[PDB]
Amino acid sequence: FKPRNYQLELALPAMKGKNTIICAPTGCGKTFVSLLICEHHLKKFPQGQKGKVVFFANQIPVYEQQKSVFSKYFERHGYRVTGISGATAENVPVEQIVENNDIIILTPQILVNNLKKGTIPSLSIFTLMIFDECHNTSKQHPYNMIMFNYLDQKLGGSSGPLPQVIGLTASVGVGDAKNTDEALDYICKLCASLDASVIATVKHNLEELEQVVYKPQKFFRKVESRISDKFKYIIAQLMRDTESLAKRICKDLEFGTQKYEQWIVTVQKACMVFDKDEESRICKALFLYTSHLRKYNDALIISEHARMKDALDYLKDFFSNVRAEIEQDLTQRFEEKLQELESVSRDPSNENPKLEDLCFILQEEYHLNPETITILFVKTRALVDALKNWIEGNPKLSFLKPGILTGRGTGMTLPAQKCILDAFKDHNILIATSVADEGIDIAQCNLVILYEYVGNVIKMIQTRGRGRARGSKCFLLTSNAGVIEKEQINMYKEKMMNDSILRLQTWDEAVFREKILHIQTHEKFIRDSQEVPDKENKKLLCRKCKALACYTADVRVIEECHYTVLGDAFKECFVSRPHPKPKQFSSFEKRAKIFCARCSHDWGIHVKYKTFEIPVIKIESFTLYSKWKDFHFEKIPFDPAE
RNA sequence: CGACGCUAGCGU
RNA sequence: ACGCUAGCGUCG
Numbered sequence: 047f048k049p050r051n052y053q054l055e056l057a058l059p060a061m062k063g064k065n066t067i068i069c070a071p072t073g074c075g076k077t078f079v080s081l082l083i084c085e086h087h088l089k090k091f092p093q094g095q096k097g098k099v100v101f102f103a104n105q106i107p108v109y110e111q112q113k114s115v116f117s118k119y120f121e122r123h124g125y126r127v128t129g130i131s132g133a134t135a136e137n138v139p140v141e142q143i144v145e146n147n148d149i150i151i152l153t154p155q156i157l158v159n160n161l162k163k164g165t166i167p168s169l170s171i172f173t174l175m176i177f178d179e180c181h182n183t184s185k186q187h188p189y190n191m192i193m194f195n196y197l198d199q200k201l202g203g204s205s206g207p208l209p210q211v212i213g214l215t216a217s218v219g220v221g222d223a224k225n226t227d228e229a230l231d232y233i234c235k236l237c238a239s240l241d242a243s244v245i246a247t248v249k250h251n252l253e254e255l256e257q258v259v260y261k262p263q264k265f266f267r268k269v270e271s272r273i274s275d276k277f278k279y280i281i282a283q284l285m286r287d288t289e290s291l292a293k294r295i296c297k298d299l300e301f302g303t304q305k306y307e308q309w310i311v312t313v314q315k316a317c318m319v320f321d322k323d324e325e326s327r328i329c330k331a332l333f334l335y336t337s338h339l340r341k342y343n344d345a346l347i348i349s350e351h352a353r354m355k356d357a358l359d360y361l362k363d364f365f366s367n368v369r370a371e372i373e374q375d376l377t378q379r380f381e382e383k384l385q386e387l388e389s390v391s392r393d394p395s396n397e398n399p400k401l402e403d404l405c406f407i408l409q410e411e412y413h414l415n416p417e418t419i420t421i422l423f424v425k426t427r428a429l430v431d432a433l434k435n436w437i438e439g440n441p442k443l444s445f446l447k448p449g450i451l452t453g454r455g456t457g458m459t460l461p462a463q464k465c466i467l468d469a470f471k472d473h474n475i476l477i478a479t480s481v482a483d484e485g486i487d488i489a490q491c492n493l494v495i496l497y498e499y500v501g502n503v504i505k506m507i508q509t510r511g512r513g514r515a516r517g518s519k520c521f522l523l524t525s526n527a528g529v530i531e532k533e534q535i536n537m538y539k540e541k542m543m544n545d546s547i548l549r550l551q552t553w554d555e556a557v558f559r560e561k562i563l564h565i566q567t568h569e570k571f572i573r574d575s576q577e578v579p580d581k582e583n584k585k586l587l588c589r590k591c592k593a594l595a596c597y598t599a600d601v602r603v604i605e606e607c608h609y610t611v612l613g614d615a616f617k618e619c620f621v622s623r624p625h626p627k628p629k630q631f632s633s634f635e636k637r638a639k640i641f642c643a644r645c646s647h648d649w650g651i652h653v654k655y656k657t658f659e660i661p662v663i664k665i666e667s668f669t670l671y672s673k674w675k676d677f678h679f680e681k682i683p684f685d686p687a688e
Numbered sequence: 689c690g691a692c693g694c695u696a697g698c699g700u
Numbered sequence: 701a702c703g704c705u706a707g708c709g710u711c712g
């Protein structure tokens with residue numbers, strides 16, 4: 047690769063030693079920029095001094111790719127390149143691995159753990175730190191944690207040769223800024239977080255850049271929601287019935303929208319605090335009652351954004367997971383109206399006008415350009431399958447050869463994700479979710495459809511990375527009309543972003559270097575200023591059947607994070623099944639998923655820790671607590687001796 | 689099992 | 701400003 051002139055331009059500040067945030071559009075080759083930087087940095091040292099670079103990537107695919115490029119590139123120059131990720135994290139001398147390698151590709155969460163564990167004494171070991179997607183440096187994110195460590199050693203009395211810090215991104219973001227001054231403040235905060243005295247962008251070479259990356263034309267499609275109440279009418283009855291069945295027990299109480307969802311979750315929270323014998327029958331009934339009631343609320347939301355068939359099949363798939371006592375009654379109410387709902391799904395006149403417009407868009411582009419590659423973004427993983435079936439089930443769309451991309455959680459694994467991206471060069475169109483955010487550098491697309499897709503200014507600028515080619519088009523399809531305005535804001539926010547950067551770049555240096563020091567200092571003492579056990583024995587009950595699980599005295603903590611149970615008393619209370627994720631995370635190894643032996647509620651997982659094979663539980667499956675952090679009791683460290 | 693980010697809704 | 705709920709994604 048012959049370096050483009052603007053790649054040198056973006057590299058210039060970093061090569062002169064300044065801490066720099068490099069802001070350039072996706073696909074412009076920011077990767078090769080960090081190579082030029084990194085190469086220049088190592089060759090600046092005299093014999094008897096060696097530089098040590100750490101490249102950060104917060105996604106495994108990006109991690110593996112960088113380690114590949116860097117290794118192939120820098121092997122010739124006599125620099126040893128290595129990497130450490132979650133799989134290679136455990137049972138290795140991290141300190142010596144860092145010591146014996148000149149360039150090190152890393153996940154940030156690993157450097158955080160090694161700093162906290164003390165295995166890595168200080169960042170002074172590194173002469174250079176490169177943050178990829180540096181806009182993630184903020185809040186509690188791992189990137190920011192690494193910099194908190196960096197900032198304390200700076201502002202503290204502790205003296206060390208702190209590393210040069212570089213960062214990379216297509217956008218810094220304006221945050222919540224309503225204007226230039228607020229936007230300029232947010233960017234200044236980020237610069238301080240990364241200790242950057244310079245924001246680098248293409249200026250002199252702009253004409254070259256725009257012949258590489260092109261800004262795809264954006265279109266706003268405002269449609270209308272279906273007026274037909276036929277489908278939601280019957281289900282509104284079913285939900286109205288389940289409301290009575292629940293009200294037929296507790297007798298006390300305090301819509302297919304999001305507001306209604308938070309209620310049913312609150313109802314369940316209210317039913318779990320409710321003789322102890324009939325109590326289990328009551329709680330289990332309410333749990334099963336609200337569960338179906340909550341999944342009926344889902345079938346509504348789906349019917350709005352997709353076919354009625356997709357919602358009916360979502361229930362048809364649900365009730366299949368129900369079977370294999372009070373469930374037989376509720377499925378009876380469904381089976382009763384099912385015959386009627388089967389016909390409503392078959393009626394073409396009731397078709398979603400939001401889909402018809404999406405169909406129309408797809409017909410035009412492929413009629414114009416049959417070689418079109420498309421990415422269709424959606425919100426929920428459920429809606430991913432709903433549209434998959436819709437395309438293959440549409441005679442008009444027959445030219446489409448759809449494929450799916452999702453995250454891990456129904457979950458799609460990494461090799462499953464990669465398997466789709468390779469066929470996307472067989473696959474005509476890719477239905478997906480936010481996984482595409484920050485980019486995997488997948489196949490180029492001349493068409494990008496945003497289906498009820500809300501996001502920030504950063505994701506917006508990133509998603510263009512699919513449309514680098516001239517003539518690429520992007521559509522936004524929503525019936526809400528609030529989604530339109532939300533995107534409009536982001537467009538204005540990008541303007542504020544680029545205006546503020548130009549305005550910041552005019553400032554004399556050493557004045558700005560002074561301001562970031564003033565931003566760092568204020569942020570430090572507030573960060574240091576933000577910082578009672580209960581020895582009583584409490585009983586942990588299963589949130590579903592309220593059966594006895596174990597006592598707080600039994601529970602031990604593993605490495606300050608994970609909670610387990612001691613004794614064979616617990617072993618009679620649960621069952622287990624192998625879950626198809628035999629991957630080792632951290633010190634553990636995932637083997638099977640735990641279930642209630644009474645019920646079948648998910649308690650936690652059964653793993654392998656060192657020599658011992660021991661279960662691990664989550665409190666949110668057992669007053670109620672969402673996490674163990676919120677649960678205050680005497681924490682007994684797990685002792686190998688017992 | 690845990691941590692973290694984004695979006696929407698809600699509350700001091 | 702934080703907190704809570706859900707969706708979505710990522711990492712250990």
Ligand SMILES: Nc1ncnc2c1ncn2[C@@H]1O[C@H](COP(=O)(O)OP(=O)(O)O)[C@@H](O)[C@H]1O
Nearest residue numbers: 047048049050071072073074075076077078487
């Ligand atoms: N000077 C260059 N000449 C030709 N291709 C380049 C050059 N620099 C980068 N690329 C190509 O850009 C592609 C992706 O760019 P990338 O490094 O991911 O930039 P960004 O991080 O901004 O998205 C790479 O596959 C690479 O082949």
Ligand code: BEF
Nearest residue numbers: 072215216484485
């Ligand atoms: F590197 Be790109 F901006 F995702």
Ligand SMILES: [Mg+2]
Nearest residue numbers: 076077178214
């Ligand atoms: Mg990149």
Ligand SMILES: [Mg+2]
Nearest residue numbers: 128142143146
């Ligand atoms: Mg090694």
Ligand SMILES: [Mg+2]
Nearest residue numbers: 104182693710
């Ligand atoms: Mg992230």
Ligand SMILES: [Zn+2]
Nearest residue numbers: 588591642645
């Ligand atoms: Zn149970």
